[PDB]
Ligand binder design. Structure first.
Ligand code: GTP
Ligand code: MG
Lengths: 1053, 171
């Protein structure tokens, strides 16, 4: 009895029922759904229980299950009966049927249609019965449904919506099997028969499936127009919902004949927000759809562009005040609208501007660009960039919009995420999940704004130059400008600094635009004097900026970085007048602050000087020849600046001089090179250091741990006390500074690295390379043993067994100094962390020095002691316990292998490769094998340690693949493979290392090692190697299985 | 006090029943148990504007077991479309769930939730979640195993239903 079904449904939908009795009722209803005659019960329920919506929906659900899961099982009679039932239920729709009931009825109708409609057309002259089974009346039935009552009209609209969605917009499996007969039928029903005949030549068997001769579009559009005039909001929304699905695919002739776009524009000007959203989606679809005939496309775009006043009015209507609370009913519509507008610019070249259509369009786009939201503006920034970079548009923009777009882009280049209460934040809480996304988007937005300004400067250089001069003059007269000029340090989180920085980024964009102009201009005869004018204007601008005597270090850094761009272009004579100002302004002293106390001000000054050095060196590399003209004046200037410049920067400027001396074709290179370099490398050969390096205790003393012990004694520090609770004092700060200053110059690793790196940074000819090798060999070869000794000491430092000889007072301090983890110090714990930082920094620079020495080629590799010196320093063995370099961080090994060993291997010359690799690789592979075996033996902070171990393993894998490649090769790998495989002494530890890699827990490392083996098996077997391989590889072990099988089959042969 | 029927829907095995459990009790379930039919769980939240109740319908996400697959959405007043970033299939079915959902209830607020964000091996990425940007759905990365965004969906739905963006939860 149906009453059981009603009771079960009440149990399920009753809030008070517990989930167990819900399960009971649900099991009963599933059995009912699975019963025979289920569709008939569903039809009976739906027809007899019109008042109870839940029960009727359940009956329709039974019918839907029938048609959607049992259509194949039913014979013809059942299928036709199902169709009759669905049609009868649809025709019986009434005003009391809820919306979801109408949706379900439409779904049933569409399902039956998809599975039966027009299947007979695949045959020639189908019989009348074949027409009946194929549902020849469907169009006629729908036309009947359309006229029954208003509810049936809405139902027909839903049927069309679902039908077209499934047939065209979605990947419906049932349609994929019938596209060739469904889609033409849809096109037939919507389009008039005459229009249809043009594209399709099919015979009379088709036309019998059409009842409305003119097609449905002749019905929907008059209905939509008549609803709009009557302001029937609901009916308009439904009609647009149906229409939005059937504008893409149908023949264009019907769209033009009915003047659909006129109706869509009328909807868009209607105050109904749903109608506006649907109409915008529809217009975008209508613009982007594929057009077979271009006359219709021309008519469409002309219609859109002739109604730019209407679109402007619509946009004005959508706008709202976001200060209090953004309106979420209209904000999505604004985003959609502005998205549509941004896609029209591709149509501009095809528009015949009879009444200023293009002007109005571009002004509208600009108006939408001023939108408070950053997403809305970001929609149009790409349009602006693309329009600026295509020479077709530039006449139009120039006459219309460029002078205003420039002003916008200039005013929109601010830091939104840091301004308090900025109007853009209101929308950020809606459009973005978290402040991270908002900041990333703001960065992208400002990038695109800078591109806009750069291109506007490139295209409209004179206009932008006048505008820029006016802007800067007006700014540095404003009170904020005066504060910036009349102050030495600014809170770089507050209005004055941010405003000044925006001005300097605008200046940078102008300079980048001026640079691009050199490439963009068509190099006519007029080019020379134009470029001369640009250079003069840049010179005047630079002199204007210098005259401000800006001192704020962090803004002065940007000013220096901007001036660096000028000199890419400026003439040789003015080059000095600018470089002298750069050097003498970046390296000014700041009495207001005591440097090296690590305060924000000191850090800002240090960054300023470091950036100045970097820019000078970069420039010297880029144009060494130009600087030759003025080189002595630069020598004089830098000598003038040296006294107040710290060592860490004395080096950075001496390297600049060195670059000029070497790569500028300046005469008498050797003596200048000596004068620049020898005073700096001298510290290596100091006899107290040469002797000192051979003792670890002396190394600790120089590091200052003895002085740390004295300091702890004078403060009565208990070695067991928690250092984190003890604060630093004046003596502590002074000792820290003294130690770091003495250490830095005791081991001039940075000076060596800089000089070698920049010396070899670029070479034109092998003759120049030989000249550099001759210059460096006398100075490096005597020093390499000491660099390796330094690295040796830094390695043995981390071993707890070594500092056991130091005073007990400092044991905890040293132990903390070796901590690995990833601001001014305040506690002895921070002091120990800083000492650890000193040690680690020296280690990194020693590795970089060793890597750089490798670039000298024959000078380093061809030596006999290079491999032993390099290996003995890194791998510190201990008698008894055979662990290598005890106590050194896994991150430490990662850095060692990544910076020193891998580049040294990669950088081996092939004429020297004969001597080096046979002596280097054996011990290298042995060390790697022992290392990774020891670390993996031990296998949140623990997860981070495991990740570091996996990183180290990947680095070793990278080294191995560099050595012998993976399963094509290049000259390096081919050459090395000869050494690896010919030398059994190399091969044995190599195979051990490979096997250990294969069996390690990391998936990527093991898989890549397996590929290496797959690429290596055929060569190694080609005696002792054979047996060792067989035994160990087999007992150790998806191409891994393939390699295992190959090994078995080969060795067992 | 007001009671809002919420229907929780999403591809099977995406963590729908774990999420409502976590809100019921602070625990967490390791097992994947296929929910059969629907589980009805009355949730409640306390806010600066009193108390609200979500009568959450936790629907089954598997074709085999969905009893009244879409009959549960009847009279719904909000919904959450749940998918897990760990498998792209569950996200690819989001539009299908949205069709099934809006088809029965038109204008209800709907929240799109990416579950299992705690695991670093997310296969769905920000460049693919633009489905919500397209359907005007509110999106949240969440995890039943981590509370960092475990309350955002219900907060947003409470704001939408109560018509009061200033509503906020307290405990
Ligand atoms: N990684 C991760 N896994 C989760 C999280 N939440 C739930 N899970 C997993 O999801 C499974 C729980 O299964 P269910 O919650 O029943 O899956 P469902 O989405 O409810 O799908 P149905 O059971 O078919 O209704 C457990 O195995 C959990 O490990 C999460 O936040 N992060
Ligand atoms: Mg579940």
């Amino acid at each position: 009895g149906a009453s059981q079904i009603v009771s079960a449904l009440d149990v399920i939908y009753s809030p008070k029922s517990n989930n167990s009795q819900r399960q009971e009722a649900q099991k009963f209803l599933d059995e009912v759904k699975l019963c025979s005659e289920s569709p008939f019960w569903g039809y009976e329920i739906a027809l007899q229980n019109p008042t109870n919506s839940i029960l009727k929906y359940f009956g329709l659900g039974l019918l839907d299950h029938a048609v959607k899961k049992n259509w194949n099982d039913y014979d013809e009679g059942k299928r036709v009966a199902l169709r009759k039932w669905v049609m009868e239920l649809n025709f019986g729709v009434q005003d009391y049927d809820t919306r979801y009931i109408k949706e379900k009825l439409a779904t049933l109708w569409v399902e039956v249609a998809k599975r039966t409609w027009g299947e007979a057309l695949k045959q020639t002259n189908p019989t009348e019965e074949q027409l009946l089974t194929s549902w020849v009346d469907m169009d006629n039935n729908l036309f009947e449904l359309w006229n029954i009552n208003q509810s049936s009209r809405e139902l027909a609209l839903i049927i069309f919506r679902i039908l077209f969605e499934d047939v065209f917009l979605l990947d419906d499996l049932i349609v994929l099997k019938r596209m060739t007969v469904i889609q033409p039928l849809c096109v037939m029903i919507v389009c008039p028969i005459e229009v249809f005949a043009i594209k399709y030549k099919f015979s009379d068997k088709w036309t019998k499936f059409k009842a409305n001769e003119e097609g449905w579009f002749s019905v929907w559009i008059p209905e939509l127009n008549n609803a709009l005039q009557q302001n029937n909001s609901e009916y308009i929304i439904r009609l647009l919902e149906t229409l939005k699905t059937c504008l893409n695919w149908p023949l264009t002739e019907v769209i033009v004949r009915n003047d659909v776009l006129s109706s869509l524009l009328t909807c868009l000007s209607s105050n109904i927000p749903r109608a506006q959203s649907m109409a915008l989606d529809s217009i975008h679809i209508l613009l982007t759809r594929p057009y077979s005939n271009e006359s219709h496309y021309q008519m469409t775009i002309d219609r859109v562009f002739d109604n730019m006043d209407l679109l402007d009015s619509v946009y004005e209507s959508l706008l709202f005040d976001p200060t209090d609370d953004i309106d979420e009913t209209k904000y999505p519509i604004i985003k959609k609208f502005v998205d549509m507008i941004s896609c029209l610019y591709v149509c501009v070249p095809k528009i015949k501007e009879t009444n200023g259509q293009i002007q109005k369009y571009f002004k509208l786009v600009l108006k939408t660009t001023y939108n408070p939201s950053l997403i809305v503006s970001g929609l149009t920034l790409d349009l602006w960039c693309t329009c600026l970079r295509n020479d077709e548009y530039l006449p139009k923009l120039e006459k219309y919009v460029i002078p205003d777009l420039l002003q916008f882009a200039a005013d929109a280049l601010v830091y939104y995420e840091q301004i308090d209460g900025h109007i853009s934040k209101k929308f950020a809480e809606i459009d973005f999940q978290s402040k991270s996304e908002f900041q990333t988007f703001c960065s992208t937005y400002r990038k695109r704004i800078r591109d806009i300004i750069r291109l506007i400067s490139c295209v409209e250089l004179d206009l932008t130059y006048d505008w820029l001069n006016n802007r800067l003059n007006n700014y540095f007269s404003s009170p904020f400008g005066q504060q910036v000029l009349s102050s030495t340090f600014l809170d770089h989180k507050l209005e004055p600094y941010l405003g000044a920085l925006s001005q300097y980024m605008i200046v940078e964009c102008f300079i980048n635009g001026c640079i691009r102009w050199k490439i963009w201009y068509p190099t006519g005869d007029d080019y020379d004097e134009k470029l001369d004018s640009i250079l003069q204007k840049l010179e005047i601008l630079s002199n204007q900026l210098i005259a401000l005597n800006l001192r704020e270090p962090l803004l002065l850094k940007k000013q220096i970085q901007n001036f660096a761009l000028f000199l890419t272009m400026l003439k040789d004579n003015v080059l000095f007048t600018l470089l002298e100002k750069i050097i003498t302004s970046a390296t000014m002293d700041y009495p207001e602050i005591n440097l090296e106390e690590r305060g924000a001000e000191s850090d800002a000054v240090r960054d300023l000087r470091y950036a100045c050095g970097i820019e000078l060196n970069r420039m010297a590399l880029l144009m060494p020849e130009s600087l030759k003209k003025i080189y002595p004046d630069l020598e004089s200037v830098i000598a003038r600046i040296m006294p107040n410049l710290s060592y860490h920067e004395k080096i950075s400027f001496k390297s600049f001089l060195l670059i000029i001396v070497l790569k500028s074709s300046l005469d008498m290179k050797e003596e200048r090179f000596a004068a620049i370099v020898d005073p700096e490398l001298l510290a290596w050969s100091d006899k107290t250091t040469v002797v000192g390096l051979s003792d670890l205790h002396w190394f600790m003393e120089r590091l200052g741990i003895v002085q740390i012990a004295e300091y702890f004694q004078r403060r009565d520090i208990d070695e067991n006390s928690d250092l984190l609770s003890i604060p630093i004092d004046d003596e502590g700060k002074e000792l820290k500074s003294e130690l770091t200053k003495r250490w830095q110059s005791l081991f001039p690793v940075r000076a060596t690295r800089m000089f070698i790196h920049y010396s070899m940074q670029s070479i034109k000819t092998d003759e120049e390379f030989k000249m550099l090798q001759d210059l460096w060999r006398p100075r490096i070869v005597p020093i390499l043993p000491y660099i390796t000794r330094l690295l040796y000491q830094l390695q043995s430092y981390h071993d707890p067994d070594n500092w056991k000889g130091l005073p007990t007072v400092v044991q905890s301090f040293v132990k903390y100094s070796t901590i690995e983890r990833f601001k001014a110090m305040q506690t002895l714990r921070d002091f120990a962390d800083s000492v650890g930082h000193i040690i680690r920094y020296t280690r990194e620079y020693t590795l970089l020095v060793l890597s750089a020495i490798s670039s000298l080629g024959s000078v380093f590799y061809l030596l006999d002691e290079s491999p032993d010196l390099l290996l003995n320093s890194i791998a510190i063995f201990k008698p008894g316990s055979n662990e290598i370099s005890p106590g050194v961080s896994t991150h430490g090994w990662k850095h060692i292998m990544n910076i020193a060993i891998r580049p040294i291997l990669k950088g081996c010359p092939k004429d020297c490769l004969g001597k080096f690799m046979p002596a280097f690789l054996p011990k290298l592979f042995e060390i790697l094998d022992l290392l990774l075996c020891q670390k993996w033996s031990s296998h949140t902070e623990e997860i981070l340690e495991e990740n570091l171990l996996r990183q180290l393993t990947t680095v070793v894998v990278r080294i191995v693949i560099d050595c012998v490649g993976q399963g094509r090769l290049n000259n390096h790998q081919m050459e090395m493979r000869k050494i690896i495989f010919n030398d059994l002494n190399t091969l044995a530890p190599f195979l051990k290392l490979l096997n250990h890699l294969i069996s390690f827990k990391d998936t990527k490392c093991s898989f890549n090692s397996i590929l290496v083996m797959k690429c290596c098996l055929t060569s190694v077997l080609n005696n002792t190697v054979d047996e060792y391989f067989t035994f160990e590889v087999m007992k150790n072990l998806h191409e891994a299985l393939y390699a295992f099988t190959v090994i078995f089959l080969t060795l067992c042969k | 006090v007001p009671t809002f029927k919420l229907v929780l829907v999403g591809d099977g095995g995406t963590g729908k029943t774990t999420f409502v459990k976590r809100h019921l009790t602070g625990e967490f379930e390791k097992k994947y148990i296929a929910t059969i039919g629907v589980e009805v769980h009355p949730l409640s939240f306390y806010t600066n504007f009193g108390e609200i109740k979500f009568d959450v319908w936790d629907t089954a996400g598997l074709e085999k077991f969905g009893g009244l697959r879409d009959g549960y959405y009847i009279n719904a007043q909000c919904a959450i479309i749940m998918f897990d970033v760990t498998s792209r299939i569950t996200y690819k079915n989001v539009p299908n769930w949205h069709r099934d959902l809006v088809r029965v209830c038109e204008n209800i607020p709907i929240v799109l939730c990416g579950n299992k964000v705690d695991v670093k091996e997310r296969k769905v990425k920000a460049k693919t979640i633009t489905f919500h940007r397209k359907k005007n759905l509110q999106y949240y990365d969440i995890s039943a195993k981590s509370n960092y965004n475990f309350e955002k969906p219900f907060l947003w739905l409470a704001r939408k239903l109560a018509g009061n963006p200033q509503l906020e939860f307290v405990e």
